[PDB]
Design an enzyme around this catalytic site. Structure first.
Site, short mmCIF file in Angstrom:
data_model
loop_
_atom_site.label_atom_id
_atom_site.label_comp_id
_atom_site.label_asym_id
_atom_site.label_seq_id
_atom_site.Cartn_x
_atom_site.Cartn_y
_atom_site.Cartn_z
N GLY B 503 0.83 -1.20 0.00
CA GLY B 503 0.00 0.00 0.00
C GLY B 503 0.86 1.25 0.00
O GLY B 503 2.07 1.18 -0.18
N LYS B 521 4.53 -4.79 8.93
CA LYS B 521 4.36 -3.64 8.06
C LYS B 521 5.67 -2.90 7.99
O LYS B 521 6.25 -2.57 9.02
CB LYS B 521 3.26 -2.70 8.55
CG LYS B 521 1.86 -3.27 8.49
CD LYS B 521 0.81 -2.25 8.90
CE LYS B 521 -0.60 -2.85 8.80
NZ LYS B 521 -1.66 -1.86 9.15
N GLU B 563 -0.49 -9.12 14.71
CA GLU B 563 -1.04 -10.47 14.66
C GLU B 563 -1.43 -10.90 13.26
O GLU B 563 -2.13 -10.16 12.57
CB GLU B 563 -2.29 -10.54 15.50
CG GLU B 563 -2.15 -10.30 16.97
CD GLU B 563 -3.48 -10.41 17.63
OE1 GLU B 563 -4.10 -11.44 17.49
OE2 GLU B 563 -3.93 -9.46 18.24
N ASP B 609 -15.92 1.24 7.13
CA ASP B 609 -15.51 0.27 6.13
C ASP B 609 -15.89 -1.18 6.44
O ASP B 609 -15.09 -2.09 6.25
CB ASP B 609 -13.99 0.37 5.94
CG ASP B 609 -13.47 -0.39 4.74
OD1 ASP B 609 -14.22 -0.63 3.82
OD2 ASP B 609 -12.31 -0.74 4.74
N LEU B 616 -11.50 -10.74 9.92
CA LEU B 616 -10.52 -11.81 9.95
C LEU B 616 -10.89 -12.92 10.89
O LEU B 616 -11.38 -12.67 11.98
CB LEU B 616 -9.18 -11.25 10.35
CG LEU B 616 -8.65 -10.18 9.42
CD1 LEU B 616 -7.32 -9.67 9.96
CD2 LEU B 616 -8.50 -10.77 8.03
#
Ligand SMILES: Nc1nc2c(ncn2[C@@H]2O[C@H](COP(=O)(O)OP(=O)(O)O)[C@@H](O)[C@H]2O)c(=O)[nH]1
Ligand SMILES: [Mg+2]
Lengths: 265, 1084, 319
Positions: B503, B521, B563, B609, B616
């Protein structure tokens, strides 16, 4: 407060269906003003716990009391269209606590009939009942109900036997289900012969004999057709809370035989 | 229609002469100026409106006789103008020329040609003038011409960019509203009646969902009225500008002041409702009039002393403290009051209250010599630029304070003063205590941070400084111990095969940390550090079980280890494995998502959103503590409200989105998701809100409760939609899970008995009429029919099943005493058996047992009943004319009720014992004990319910003794005349569950092994009639509860037989997760 | 003894060495040139004589009882090593000049730690030679990373930058512990700092420059055993007390003395890691502390500090 009017407030009650409540009627054309002042003085003694001070509402000629959603007791004067003879009406829910409240109230009313009207015993006692919720009620003269109480059966409709009613619901204070648990007569333990060999003494109520209640020799008071049932519970009222070593204690009542069981030694 | 009204904004500093300028040409003095009607707003005093709530022309007025210094003072004004309307025109006018030598005139002329007219960062001043005096002038004549022509030019410029001119046409209905708002006489001009006013003027702009919002939008931009859009006094409170401005400005002038004393004054000045007063104070905050200190105090930034109080700080040697500077060309208007509001909440312990001091231009927090903080403005000679100085003591708590301060400063600027993002960030350091500080830009320290080196003196290598002391916020030294990255645990490669996604932030790889699967990330060269710290701020302080937590962060390569989900995202599961998606699993997923939403909403965070792609799963095992989590907290799936593109997001938008998620879960095929493939219909469908019935349309097995939840959730009106807290409460229900079906019966239909066919339909009796009417319910289609089959009312039905003969019959016992027997395979095969001497009260069937009202029991041979007029095998006299049989139970010895006695039978139909139960009156109450038996349940003890009793008796069949009483009133007494407490029916399940129906709409679940209340199921219907245990055509076992719902309504409810277990299991599930939530939040 | 020895006003000392047989040699920090002063503890006398152009950074005693002589080695800012006989102050010798300034000395052979992270080793009797070359030179750090702690307590523990060294009998780096990993605990600004003092018994006690805490390391597994928070102890005490650790002394009975940059000295029990007693307001700023015996063999602590008019004070503290 005796200064209050005879107003009867629109209070929504629990137990709105016919089988949910017990209704007792006392008929007499007029109850000389002062009657209800004496009545409320004795009505402000009711307390089922003795065997709480709820939001009672005195109606001059009667009282609301309230107690609880579970158990409540309305007592007061009534009159119907084309029925000029006035009457007292008691409403309690069909349960033991209601029975207790009823029993204490009807004893207060009758003690008043003895007090306010000495020797008068008019004052017709009726059991108001119905064979189906939502239907019209009918009245049973308690004298006739007592004739049937002897039998111990249900009210049986002779035209429609399918319809029957427990006498104890019809008149909760007739059969002593509202006694302190410890004095309900165990009919499987009262070894009472009633023979002359068991005779101890007597009285205006009938006779005093002995019995082996629960294996122990006890005194038994037989209300031998001398105002039985009535005098029996009136004595129980005296016996209630009567506690001293020098006194004769109560070792269970017995409304079915009308035979009180007392301490014998 | 061609609207010809435009605003005139006149700005400048106090003493400029700008009002008299206006006078001759013709907080804020507002008046019309027809020339073209201008709506002139004269910012007389310091009316923060130009920053608190900023088709207009700007007139910049300044005093020429003051000179160039004043010109510089106007830079913040010009900045602010550019910052909100760079395209708007600006006319610069110098005043006091008649008392200002041309030296100053030309000095200022050159000043503006050098620093404003030809300088970016300012909104390209369109023109300028100089005026001698407001007596009149040729300059003023020219100015008037300039204002007119330039305002015309401006609107031409708008046509070139915006598409609108000074006669731009706007919907005439909005114009009408303007006039309607003009005509308002109200003592305390706060408007809500506007809805009525819409109805007064017929009903224009009827699209409440679109036109109404546009009208309001126009009304603020056009200068007519004020919405205040998260305040409570916002949407329904339109307020007259004159009052808003006047009262708040006055109160400022009517510096720490107690709230209560302000309330006292205000209550005398203007009698506002206390509700409005709470909002009043909130407005004072939002309009920078006064800031909340303690709950009882206000700061009142404006008017605070501007003479920085003498403060002696502890620590003096250079190495004892950390200093950070922010170089600016000028502070933006309102910069300081906003900054202060943010800095007041700083605390080194959030992971005694401080001795706070205020300078107007700075804040001093004390706390302790160990950790304190000073922020304030300082200016050095020969350096025009103003600037901030932040000082904290060099230790961990000092670091934490520093981190909070600089995070607030940068956030402040990003939101309110973009354009600056100028802001030269300097760090101060020295290589020896007692010497002077040296300056370095943080960008260069970041270059060194990447090296990881000590700051080394290029001229003398012996002199070095450990970077952290200079800038402990570049190296993440202010993290909680729990999230410091242990470099001996983290194992990753950054190789292509581990790439999970990417992203604008960089990329995500799969990795191992302490033996567990994690995602990393990486902020791979994308304005890092600032993005990194923003994410750290959000991730910390959010510690809920349903959210994805952070598993350590590390500046060395700029990573967030988080996680990793084990089973992947929901969307995939929906399209790849419906077998896993059981009814149990589905429910649990709904709970976990709802918790996340409740939490985030309480945290003032709008998710915006909710789609299957964001959910998950961490295990498909139905009975796990944690199953679903919400990803990345902090398309065609939009609320129709926000889909308009002209409103603001709030919790109700998320709720709507949630409802759609639930709809998607309900239909496991993801049928609306499949609709996405044809987006032209999909997005519009959601906008329309006209969704198809999830059962009928997709062939989805019924799931009432949820079905109505979705309907309740997905409402058009935001104020009608449920709050997320309520949504959760609804989902938190065993009844929700176990109720499977609900079938309403036709109005005025009363069924007095039920026979389910054990093989998917139910035979129903009918007590509504006085005629033998037999009804029939098809559970497969919810079909319903009915026909008259007998004369007198049907009392009992029984199913005769002869699988040997390949046939079955319905036996209908009725009031007449007859037995109508009808072949289930052939409606024409109807016949009557030997008539009974009294009515039939109960049936059981193998032998067909007929219990009649006269206490007589007839026993018919198994197959014999097929023949018309058939006689019974044998007949027994149990009771009598007044003691009817009412119950034949068997769980091969029979048990049953006859009046007040309990009987029992052998296989030879002989009486094995007559238990008189009247003796139970020694306990409980005689009128309850003395009553006809309604039902007998036979287990390891007998459970007896009598007519109109509130008490169930328990008998020991082995000794014939009373072994306990069950008081139904008591159980509902604990629950806070529908509460009759009358026992209706008893059903018993061999897993110890005991089902007790009652007079009101309640079902008690008791535990047979302990005689305890599992749960009260209630608000079912008006009254319970019968309960059955039956196996469906799917072989699933359910409870069939038929009840009344007086409007004589009646209905059949089908419950999952495992309800008792679900009640307990659900309760456990909820509690475990509750504890985990506290565990997490407490660690921090 | 707790003898309050006061020196002349504005006397500043940058180094100290005592003769372990009753007198002390001190470097004249208050001057701009290597002057070597001398304190006679037997008479409380004090003198001084120039020894170098640059200032003295470290003094050390070389004693050769087999030669019946002793010398004071002067490690100066210039990087040179001047050897001064104590029996004859004019009998001076010279050891080979270092590549950078000398930060520390330890003397059989003389260890010489330098600013550029090197350790020169001079064989004991080279002390009698002029222009003498070293026995061996080790490459430990670099120009940005100075070597400063020589703590033998029979192997040598070396404090260099952020790393801890252990040297063998033949000067082999037996162990190397980088202590930067301690950042998980404490605070990075402290963790990342040059090591000043290393004390070793069963564990290593590390005093880093400008730190308020002391790191405790496990010599057997090379792991952080714990932290000693000095500023906490001063917090318990009811910019004079920064809490910055200046020096660590340790007696075999776990008596850890922590001199701070203020007037307090923290005595702490290392068998339980428990503060025993703080010396209160000793001087305005404690510089260094040395364990030594007097002419009577009395075990005393030579607490040298300032009462800032710089009043240097040496208290011969009663151990
Ligand atoms: N000499 C001179 N003084 C002026 C001129 N215009 C305004 N002033 C003075 O400015 C004052 C008006 O200030 P005002 O506009 O009320 O104050 P402001 O709104 O705070 O700027 C009057 O006293 C004017 O005489 C001018 O053209 N020449
Ligand atoms: Mg003005």
């Amino acid at each position: 407060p005796s200064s209050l009017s005879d107003h009867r407030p629109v209070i929504e009650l629990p137990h709105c269906e016919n089988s949910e409540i017990i209704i007792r009627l006392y008929e007499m054309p007029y109850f000389p003003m002062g009657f209800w002042s004496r009545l409320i003085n004795r009505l402000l003694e009711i307390s089922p716990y003795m065997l709480l001070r709820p939001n009672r509402m005195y109606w001059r000629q009667g009282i609301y009391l309230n107690w609880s959603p579970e158990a409540y007791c309305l007592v007061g004067s009534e009159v119907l269209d084309n029925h000029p003879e006035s009457f007292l009406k008691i409403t309690v829910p069909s349960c033991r606590k209601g029975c207790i409240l009823l029993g204490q109230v009807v004893d207060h009313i009758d003690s008043l009939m003895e007090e306010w009207f000495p020797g008068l015993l008019l004052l017709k006692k009726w059991a108001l009942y119905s064979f189906n919720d939502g239907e019209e009620h009918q009245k049973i003269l308690l004298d006739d109900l007592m004739k049937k109480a002897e039998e111990g059966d249900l009210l049986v409709n002779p035209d429609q036997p399918r319809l029957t009613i427990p006498i104890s619901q019809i008149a909760p204070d007739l059969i002593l289900a509202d006694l302190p648990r410890n004095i309900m007569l165990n009919n499987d333990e009262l070894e009472f012969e009633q023979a002359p060999e068991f005779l101890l003494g007597d009285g205006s109520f009938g006779s005093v004999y002995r019995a082996a209640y629960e294996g122990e020799e006890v005194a038994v008071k037989i209300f031998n057709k001398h105002t039985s049932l009535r005098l029996l519970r009136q004595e129980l009222v005296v016996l209630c809370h009567l506690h001293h070593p020098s006194l004769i204690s109560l070792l269970a009542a017995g409304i079915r035989p009308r035979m009180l069981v007392m301490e014998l030694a």
